[PDB]
Design a protein around this nucleic acid. Structure first.
Lengths: 213, 459
DNA sequence: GGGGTTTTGGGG
């Protein structure tokens, strides 16, 4: 696996969103190239791009250690994330492009140092990790095993359709509604019976770090 | 005053007009120039082969470059062989080849004419168009066609049909074999056959490609962008890249300027490639031996009589079937889905005794059930369009009336007694509920329920 | 940038 981000994000999903369960070998600092900075700050490991999430207690440090080195102008310049985290949370994939099937693996950052001796170097034009074939399927598998688990606990008793209702159907006319069956503890139309600890870390909205500077 | 590609003046500053056959073209893309560019390879009766000899099957061509300020002003080339008509095009010489340039914002204009009875668009919508002189797509608000052009158009069609039927337009040099994919520094073209179209999600499809090299690759194709992609059709991918960061599947990455072109019926290349390239299922049978399979495996095969029948979504099948005036008329449907849970949970209870005269089924547990042996399996399925909701739909496999009896390829029998039959069904049960396992079935509607019929497992 | 890389960031 040549993509550092694809291995990371795949590992997280295959471990129920537990950043602890993922191998401590991948905990190492990530020196990655910055593709964009505004309207969307997108970083790249050389193969794919992801939208990192800065802390309102992390950019303060960035200005202290690197005064006047504006973050919005970091485009096309390498950054090194020292301490980072990987959260998982439900979102609306129709409004957030850095997600898939209402699920997003966020790259939380706490400390990042800009390395100036870096130029253009991506091995290819970077693509959205959440648009990749294998990775989109990795998430499909995640929701599959979660749906299959929530289904085997909700639907009980082997409630089969009475064969009489299907025999000599001619004189019988029915509504398709009958076939529909709720998959889990319904709290709306959206299936949400997941067993992962959702991320609840307050993050900096890209607009703030722009107007702030 | 239409000029011919090879006879076009390379010096006269006077804009030239012409008719031509499109053999290749990129998808209209955007540049930071706030300009939308569209590049295509055009050919006509004067410029088509290398000009060295017939051995050089390598088709010589002229390159047409269109510039616009809006996406809607550029032509979307889905098929190769169709005719394009350019007005006010300036000719230039770029690296040995004749390059025609056109600014559709200033004075240039174009018009696309279909070489076949129906164009790709009016072929999907099942539209009927016997108007052979009208273009299916043109640059501006109005398109004029004099009676003099008719002779040119109808003769250029005859030539196109003869050119494509006697020559493999897309020569060996304009594409790379799939087994050489990882050896290319970057950008490369591919002429393959669509072995399988998988509806990954709401917006994207997944094409299972295979060319003469024997290699099998996968690629993500958007629905809105490429709606002409069908199973069994030979296509040409304009711009592809080998996905180095894909370990379980051989993947091809496409860009916004990339294009999937199909050929006109007369095509010799597409014709030969449809026959010479068959599916192997080697990828499928291999993936089935793995816990987590990243490859989609269509477990079933629909009867030959429903092979032409279109596939209706599970959402339409269950949420719109009682409202939509078109779905109320139909009784038989075709659909694709994935089984989440199978009921009864006990495989042995899948086959029960059935009374014809009473219409009631009974268990063969204590072998007390004296009725005829029938299947009474109930599938709780899910769809790609249903992927996000908190629902699961009921699809039945009740074989009392002969519907879907041959499904498991094993005839109904007392599962409590026949061990052979039990094992076979137990194997299929874990196969159906397994991730990435899909069912392509045909269903008959009875009293508000859907029954599997004329469908069977092939694994 | 014509054999090219936008944002509409799942036609562009």
């Amino acid at each position: 696996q040549q993509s550092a981000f694809k291995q990371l994000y795949t590992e997280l999903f295959n471990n129920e969103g537990d950043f602890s369960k993922v191998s401590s070998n991948l905990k190492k600092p990530l020196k990655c190239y910055v593709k964009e900075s505004y309207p969307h700050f997108l970083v790249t490991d050389g193969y794919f791009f992801v939208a990192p999430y800065f802390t309102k207690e992390a950019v303060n440090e960035f200005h202290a250690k690197f005064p006047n080195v504006n973050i919005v102008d970091l485009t096309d310049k390498v950054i090194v994330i020292n301490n980072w985290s990987l959260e998982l949370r439900r979102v609306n994939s129709a409004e957030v492009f850095t997600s898939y099937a209402n699920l997003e693996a966020r790259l939380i950052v706490h400390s990042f140092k800009p390395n100036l001796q870096e130029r253009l170097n991506p091995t290819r034009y970077p693509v959205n990790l959440f648009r990749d074939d294998e990775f989109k399927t990795t998430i499909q598998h995640f929701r599959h095993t979660a749906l299959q688990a929530a289904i085997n606990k909700t639907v009980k008793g082997d409630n089969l359709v009475d064969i009489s209702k299907v025999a000599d159907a001619a004189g019988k006319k029915g509504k398709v509604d009958a076939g529909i069956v709720k998959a889990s503890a319904s709290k709306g139309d959206e299936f949400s019976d997941f067993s992962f600890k959702e991320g609840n870390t307050a993050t900096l909205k890209i607009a703030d770090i722009f107007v702030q500077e | 005053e239409y000029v011919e590609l090879a006879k076009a003046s390379l010096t006269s500053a006077q804009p030239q007009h012409f008719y031509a056959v499109v053999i290749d073209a990129t998808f209209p893309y955007k540049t930071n120039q706030e300009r939308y560019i569209c590049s295509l390879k055009i050919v006509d009766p004067t410029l088509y082969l290398k000009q060295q000899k017939g051995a050089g099957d390598a088709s010589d061509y002229a390159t047409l470059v269109l510039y616009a300020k809006r996406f809607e002003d550029l032509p979307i080339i889905h098929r190769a062989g169709d005719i394009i008509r350019v007005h006010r095009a300036t000719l230039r010489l770029y690296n040995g080849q004749r390059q025609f340039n056109a600014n559709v914002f200033y004075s240039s204009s174009w018009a696309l004419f279909s070489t076949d009875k129906r164009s790709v668009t009016q072929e999907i919508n099942n539209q009927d168009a016997v108007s052979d002189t009208t273009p299916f797509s043109f640059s501006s608000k109005h398109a004029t066609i004099e009676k003099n052009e008719i002779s040119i158009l109808q003769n250029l069609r005859k030539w196109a049909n003869q050119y494509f039927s006697s020559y493999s337009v897309i020569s060996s040099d304009m594409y790379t074999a799939l087994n050489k994919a990882q050896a290319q520094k970057g950008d490369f073209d591919v002429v393959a056959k669509i072995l399988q179209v998988h509806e990954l999600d709401e917006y994207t499809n997944e094409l299972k490609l295979k060319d003469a090299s024997g290699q099998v690759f996968y690629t993500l194709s958007l629905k809105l962008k490429f709606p002409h992609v069908r199973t069994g059709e030979v296509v040409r991918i304009r711009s592809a890249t080998y996905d180095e960061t894909s370990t379980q599947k051989k993947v091809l990455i496409l860009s916004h300027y990339s294009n999937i072109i199909t050929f006109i019926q007369s095509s010799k290349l597409a014709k030969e490639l449809r026959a010479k390239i068959q599916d192997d299922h080697s990828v499928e049978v291999a993936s089935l031996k793995k816990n987590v399979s990243l490859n989609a495996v269509v477990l079933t095969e629909v009867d030959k009589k429903h092979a032409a029948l279109p596939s209706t979504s599970l959402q339409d099948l269950f949420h719109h079937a009682d409202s939509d005036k078109e779905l109320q008329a139909q009784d038989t449907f075709r659909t694709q889905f994935y089984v989440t849970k199978i009921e009864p949970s006990d495989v042995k209870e899948w086959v029960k005794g059935y009374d014809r005269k009473t219409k009631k089924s009974s268990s063969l547990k204590g072998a007390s059930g004296k009725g005829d042996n029938i299947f009474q399996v109930q599938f709780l399925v899910k769809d790609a369009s249903t992927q996000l909701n908190n629902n699961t739909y009921r699809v039945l496999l009740y074989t009392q009336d002969g519907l879907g009896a041959n499904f498991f390829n094993v005839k109904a029998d007392n599962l409590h007694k026949n061990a052979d039959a039990r094992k076979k069904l137990e194997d299929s049960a874990e196969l159906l509920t397994k991730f990435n396992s899909y069912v392509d079935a045909v269903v008959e509607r009875r009293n508000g329920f859907y029954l599997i019929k004329d469908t069977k497992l092939i694994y």
